[PDB]
Write a protein that binds this DNA or RNA. Structure first.
Ligand SMILES: [Mg+2]
Ligand SMILES: [Mg+2]
Ligand SMILES: [Mg+2]
Ligand SMILES: [Mg+2]
Ligand SMILES: [Mg+2]
Ligand SMILES: [Mg+2]
Ligand SMILES: [Mg+2]
Ligand SMILES: [Mg+2]
Ligand SMILES: [Mg+2]
Ligand SMILES: [Mg+2]
Ligand SMILES: [Mg+2]
Ligand SMILES: [Mg+2]
Ligand SMILES: [Mg+2]
Ligand SMILES: [Mg+2]
Ligand SMILES: [Mg+2]
Ligand SMILES: [Mg+2]
Ligand SMILES: [Mg+2]
Ligand SMILES: [Mg+2]
Ligand SMILES: [Mg+2]
Ligand SMILES: [Mg+2]
Ligand SMILES: [Mg+2]
Ligand SMILES: [Mg+2]
Ligand SMILES: [Mg+2]
Ligand SMILES: [Mg+2]
Ligand SMILES: [Mg+2]
Ligand SMILES: [Mg+2]
Ligand SMILES: [Mg+2]
Ligand SMILES: [Mg+2]
Ligand SMILES: [Mg+2]
Ligand SMILES: [Mg+2]
Ligand SMILES: [Mg+2]
Ligand SMILES: [Mg+2]
Ligand SMILES: [Mg+2]
Ligand SMILES: [Mg+2]
Ligand SMILES: [Mg+2]
Ligand SMILES: [Mg+2]
Ligand SMILES: [Mg+2]
Ligand SMILES: [Mg+2]
Ligand SMILES: [Mg+2]
Ligand SMILES: [Mg+2]
Ligand SMILES: [Mg+2]
Ligand SMILES: [Mg+2]
Ligand SMILES: [Mg+2]
Ligand SMILES: [Mg+2]
Ligand SMILES: [Mg+2]
Ligand SMILES: [Mg+2]
Ligand SMILES: [Mg+2]
Ligand SMILES: [Mg+2]
Ligand SMILES: [Mg+2]
Ligand SMILES: [Mg+2]
Ligand SMILES: [Mg+2]
Ligand SMILES: [Mg+2]
Ligand SMILES: [Mg+2]
Ligand SMILES: [Mg+2]
Ligand SMILES: [Mg+2]
Ligand SMILES: [Mg+2]
Ligand SMILES: [Mg+2]
Ligand SMILES: [Mg+2]
Ligand SMILES: [Mg+2]
Ligand SMILES: [Mg+2]
Ligand SMILES: [Mg+2]
Lengths: 120, 209, 122, 114, 56
RNA sequence: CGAUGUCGGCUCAUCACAUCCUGGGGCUGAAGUAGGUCCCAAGGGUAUGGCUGUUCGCCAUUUAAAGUGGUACGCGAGCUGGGUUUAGAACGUCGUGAGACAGUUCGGUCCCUAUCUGCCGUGGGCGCUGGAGAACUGAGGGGGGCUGCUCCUAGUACGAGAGGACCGGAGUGGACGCAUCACUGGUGUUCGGGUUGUCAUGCCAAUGGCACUGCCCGGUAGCUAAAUGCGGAAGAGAUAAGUGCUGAAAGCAUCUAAGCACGAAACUUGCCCCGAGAUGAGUUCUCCCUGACCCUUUAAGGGUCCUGAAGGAACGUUGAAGACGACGACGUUGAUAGGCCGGGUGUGUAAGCGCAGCGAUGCGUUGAGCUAACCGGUACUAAUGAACCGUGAGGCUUAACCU
RNA sequence: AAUUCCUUGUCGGGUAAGUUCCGACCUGCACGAAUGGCGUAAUGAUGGCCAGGCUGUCUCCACCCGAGACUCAGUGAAAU
RNA sequence: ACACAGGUGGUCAGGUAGAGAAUACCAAGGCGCUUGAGAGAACUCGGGUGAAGGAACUAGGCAAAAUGGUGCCGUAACUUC
RNA sequence: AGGACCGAACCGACUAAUGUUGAAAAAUUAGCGGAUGACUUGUGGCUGGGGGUGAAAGGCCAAUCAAACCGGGAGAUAGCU
């Protein structure tokens, strides 16, 4: 029925979405912009925004939870140092979805997900 | 009398000092205002047109905005009708709150049920599932036979098959009203009313009982 | 939810140790039996010197269910183990003398005062 | 939900002692025969606490003279009169449903003593 | 699951009458560049709403 | 016979009335209760099991009753394959034999993506004639219609006694249907925790992956039944069988011929639902549009420039809506969704450190930390301004009031 | 009885209820002694039958996780 | 018949746990299988879990469920011992 | 010691489901039987159509068997369609 049920499935395993979103989150905390389809972009926003919110206060325990999920010292290094103090005053959404054309191979409605860090 | 238009706002329990719990549904009935009255002199029947709620200044369209302008009332989120009981004519612009149910003991509720999509035959019509073993290949929850043979030669008009379940207007009647929270603009009914928590309800006094 | 083929326990000194409900009495096509509903049982296990033996088709009345009984506030009372008290078909009186294993207050219906008088608790 | 939370807070009884699962509670309940309103006790171990506003309910288990008896208690119901805890337990679960198999000596738990 | 007679070339074309495509019927003209692009999509140049959001 | 798969079971049924029950009556060798029998009646309901391949039947225990048949002895392009008529084997019997037996026994691949009709749902186009946005009327269809027990009446009527009412009323259940998660529970591979093996993050300490979610214990939202509410009806109209009144034909008599009144779960409504494609295309309310030139077989004509409203659509954020369309809310004059903050709820005392002990580990910090869909707020991110479609007072004849 | 048509023979046991099953009575349609007769420890992806355990086989299904089905893009059949 | 879930003899065959070449997680090395992207209906297939009852299912406990390891204690009728 | 026992390789194929215009002109998934022998298997030979071989089913003899396949009698014959 799906009534009030959230979280997209993306035709994949629960063990696949766990690791796909783990790596796709790590690419955005390594390049700040990535191109992907909408149903992945609408979901990447759901796992990075709570990740940045977690990285808002530096701690020993927070950097464990930041490493438990996302399993990367480097992404954790870019957080708490770069992306931690950068979005300290912005309260809420730390990313932005920008739609674009379609994939020529399979007609997927692509979109640009990016951190709000274009202006330097 | 006629009935009011409210909005289903969840359900709770109301404890009696005897000790019996009462499953009570809270019905938010705001100030129902009357936009138009109808008489046999122009409409052939005797009924009123109510409205409740508050739309936005950009959403109430021009044909709608002129309709609320003739009464001189605010623009609600919908319009409904209520057939009059021969001696209860109201005026255009009159606001009925909840007080008509100050003496009513049993009400009937009317609202659109929850939508369930394209439901199966065992779910929509309570057909029994076949044996899911012993030999049953590829047919566990199917309907099985749907008609006889050459003599009828066709499926009869009105066969219970798979289709759209729910998302239709139903009327669960003879519900006892528990407490008329007049100053909070509520209505407490014993039981369960159709509709999701937020979909409107046409509550009206019991015609059957 | 006591129904046909349900293996019960005996809650009094009548002679049986384990009985099996063969048909839930009452209404036609009745599926499950409840709190103090009458059922027809058969005796599957017995003591040697009892008033009854294996294979007696006598009635009973449920007393303790593993499903429970819901008091009118929603407070269910959930026993652990199905049990019953044997009856005397034509006259419906309890054939057992001392009923052990606490009963529920829903039995107080003018036909089971003899059971709620001989019960230890509740 | 300001409508619901208003109707929910007005009927909950504001004197419930905060207990935990594992505590051996002693519950007094208003049992009536219709005419004679009488208070009786119910001594047992708190099996689960399902605390949710007015609809909060907890269950306790008494191993009676026959077998184990469990009953849930509508916490804010008028039939529940007193829920004075006797002693306090120390367990590492929110719900002790595993005791439904443990009988006798195997179904005893420790005490906090803090 | 097999046809008894054959359908006509009439019945075929009647069935495809719903399979006709729909045009977009409107192109949004951008503020800055003035290119014609889809609504809520970036330009082929890579601008959106007035800003170089593709950085290419 | 260039193919109609022969039994029974499962499932889903539908019709007939020669009716098993409930309902309305006559007669009774009908006191009462309970029955016998016939007439009217098909609205609804019309067993679970042991043995058998069985339908059937017998048996056990219930029920208000566990109806009789048609529909390829309904239903294999829906499912079983036990029986029966494939190839193997054996026993009894028959025959010299190969083999044979409405004799028997053990084992034996059951195919098909649905063009059309039909049926269950759901949209597009055009019509409805000036267009658009809403609320209804209602033709005509469908769903629903079952019923026990106990008490009061009264343990009165009736009856030697034992027993033991109709009618009327109230309450409580069984089966079935509708609706709903507040409770009682189930699921809950998106939340928490425990733990085995092993690999990895350089190691210890902590974590992640994989092994059916690794295996388990609990659990939010949603869904859901075993859970919780509700429903059948009352009443009205016209009738069946039947009961009658008055009453001639036939001085009487008679329910009928004129005339009139009673009379069932069947019929028509009353209850709920779909419903103006009801082409007989309805009614009411409101809103919007009242600009100029040419040709002309000069006609409800064709074309251009100037203007294109109300509204719709499109795209977008999505929804307790949903297969896809559609439907509902919102589109910054913003709460539609995500995030965030607080709360609730769930799991149970995180990490690190300190201390006690050789140690596993415990205690304190701390009922902490982590908390998914839930509740109330807040524009931080995304719903961009425009554009597209749709037009410019709405034919003829006739009549009624005005001019 | 892998044999008994009549037949679910009749009695007893198992069961609330047993056309199958187990033990017997002989009225053996139509058992019978190497086309072997009667028993037999063990063994059997053997036949029949019963009890315990155990469970969604079922009472009666409910939910969830994936692969198709559904929508869009590419390619593109078949019996008939 | 194909870039087909099939068939094809012999040899080498590590680490941890384990009785083992079982099985599980890894090394070396080799691959993600030549259609994908969304939605999250009925229904179908591969599976998970389940209140009370527990074969009431059915031709039949078919299929599932379940038991399951190493030591030690202990183990009947019958028997060719 | 054993045509011994449990159990992989290997061989075999009892049950169920899927499949049955399939991935396959008899396979796959989850369980099963044997698994030191009357075993299995690689390589090369030998037995041939009224014949071969057969722990015997009238099974097998190149996806064909109560008498293979190919060519030739032969345009057999057909009171049948
Ligand atoms: Mg949501
Ligand atoms: Mg796909
Ligand atoms: Mg069934
Ligand atoms: Mg088969
Ligand atoms: Mg098959
Ligand atoms: Mg199947
Ligand atoms: Mg098409
Ligand atoms: Mg033909
Ligand atoms: Mg046949
Ligand atoms: Mg009727
Ligand atoms: Mg049966
Ligand atoms: Mg029968
Ligand atoms: Mg049996
Ligand atoms: Mg043969
Ligand atoms: Mg349409
Ligand atoms: Mg009708
Ligand atoms: Mg009555
Ligand atoms: Mg729960
Ligand atoms: Mg779980
Ligand atoms: Mg290492
Ligand atoms: Mg370590
Ligand atoms: Mg783990
Ligand atoms: Mg009536
Ligand atoms: Mg009349
Ligand atoms: Mg008459
Ligand atoms: Mg009729
Ligand atoms: Mg309507
Ligand atoms: Mg406009
Ligand atoms: Mg839309
Ligand atoms: Mg605001
Ligand atoms: Mg929000
Ligand atoms: Mg809490
Ligand atoms: Mg601690
Ligand atoms: Mg941890
Ligand atoms: Mg929070
Ligand atoms: Mg016999
Ligand atoms: Mg016998
Ligand atoms: Mg012989
Ligand atoms: Mg001889
Ligand atoms: Mg022999
Ligand atoms: Mg013998
Ligand atoms: Mg053998
Ligand atoms: Mg058994
Ligand atoms: Mg396509
Ligand atoms: Mg390939
Ligand atoms: Mg291959
Ligand atoms: Mg090794
Ligand atoms: Mg080792
Ligand atoms: Mg291996
Ligand atoms: Mg590698
Ligand atoms: Mg699915
Ligand atoms: Mg399971
Ligand atoms: Mg059991
Ligand atoms: Mg098995
Ligand atoms: Mg298994
Ligand atoms: Mg072989
Ligand atoms: Mg295999
Ligand atoms: Mg094996
Ligand atoms: Mg060879
Ligand atoms: Mg020829
Ligand atoms: Mg010749």
């Amino acid at each position: 029925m799906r009534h009030r049920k959230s979280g997209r499935q993306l035709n994949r395993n629960s063990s696949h979405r766990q690791a796909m979103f783990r790596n796709m989150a790590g690419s955005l905390v390594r390049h700040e912009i990535i191109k992907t389809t909408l149903p992945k972009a609408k979901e990447l926003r759901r796992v990075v925004e709570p990740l940045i919110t977690l990285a808002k206060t530096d701690s020993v325990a927070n950097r464990r939870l930041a490493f438990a999920r996302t399993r990367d010292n480097e992404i954790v290094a870019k957080l708490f140092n770069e992306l931690g103090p950068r979005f300290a005053s912005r309260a809420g959404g730390y990313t932005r979805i920008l739609k674009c054309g379609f994939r020529a191979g399979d007609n997927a409605p692509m979109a640009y997900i990016e951190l709000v860090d274009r202006s330097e | 009398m006629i009935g009011l238009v409210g909005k289903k706002v969840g359900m709770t329990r109301i404890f009696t000092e005897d000790g019996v719990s009462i499953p009570v549904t809270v019905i938010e009935v705001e100030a129902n205002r009357v936009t138009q009255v109808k008489d046999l002199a122009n409409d052939g029947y005797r009924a009123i047109q109510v409205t409740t709620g508050a739309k936005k200044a950009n959403r109430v369209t021009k044909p709608e905005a002129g309709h609320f302008a003739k009464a001189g009332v605010e623009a609600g989120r919908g319009l409904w009708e209520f057939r009059l009981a021969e001696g209860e004519e109201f005026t255009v612009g009159q606001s009925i709150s909840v007080e008509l149910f100050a003496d009513v003991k049993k009400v009937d509720v009317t609202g659109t049920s929850k939508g369930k999509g394209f439901a199966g035959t065992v779910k929509r019509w309570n057909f029994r599932t076949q044996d899911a073993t012993h030999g049953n290949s590829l047919s566990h929850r199917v309907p099985g036979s749907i008609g006889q043979n050459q003599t009828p030669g066709k499926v009869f008009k009105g066969k219970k098959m798979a289709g759209q379940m729910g998302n239709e207007r139903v009327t669960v009647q003879s519900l006892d009203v528990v407490r008329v929270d007049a100053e909070r603009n509520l209505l407490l009914v014993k039981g369960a009313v159709p509709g999701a928590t937020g979909s409107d309800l046409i509550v009206k006094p019991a015609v059957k009982a | 939810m006591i129904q046909e083929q349900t293996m019960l326990n005996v809650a009094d000194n009548s002679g049986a140790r384990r009985v099996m409900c063969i048909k839930v009495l009452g209404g036609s096509h009745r599926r499950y039996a409840g709190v103090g509903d009458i059922i027809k049982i058969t005796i599957k296990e017995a003591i040697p010197r009892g008033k009854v033996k294996k294979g007696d088709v006598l009635k009973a009345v449920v007393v303790r269910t593993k499903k429970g009984v819901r008091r009118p506030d929603g407070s269910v009372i959930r026993f652990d183990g199905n049990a019953c008290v044997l009856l005397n078909n034509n006259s419906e009186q309890p054939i057992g003398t001392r009923i052990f294993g606490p009963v529920t207050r829903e039995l107080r219906s003018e036909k089971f005062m003899k059971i709620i008088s001989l019960a230890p608790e509740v | 939900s300001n409508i619901i939370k208003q109707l929910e807070q007005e009927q909950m009884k504001q004197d419930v002692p905060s207990f935990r699962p594992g505590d051996t509670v002693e519950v007094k309940v208003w049992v009536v025969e219709g005419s004679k309103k009488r208070l009786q006790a119910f001594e047992g171990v708190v099996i689960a606490i399902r605390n949710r506003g007015l609809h909060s309910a907890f269950t306790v288990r008494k191993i009676s003279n026959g077998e184990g008896v469990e009953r849930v208690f509508q916490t804010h119901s008028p039939v529940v009169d007193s829920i004075s805890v006797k002693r306090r337990g120390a367990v590492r679960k929110a719900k002790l449903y595993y005791l439904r198999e443990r009988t006798g000596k195997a179904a005893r738990i420790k005490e906090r003593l803090n | 699951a097999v046809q008894q007679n054959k359908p006509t070339r009439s019945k075929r074309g009647m069935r495809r009458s719903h399979d006709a495509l729909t045009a977009v019927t409107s192109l949004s003209v951008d503020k800055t560049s003035g290119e014609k692009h889809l609504r809520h999509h970036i330009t082929a140049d890579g601008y959106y709403r007035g800003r170089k959001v593709i950085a290419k």
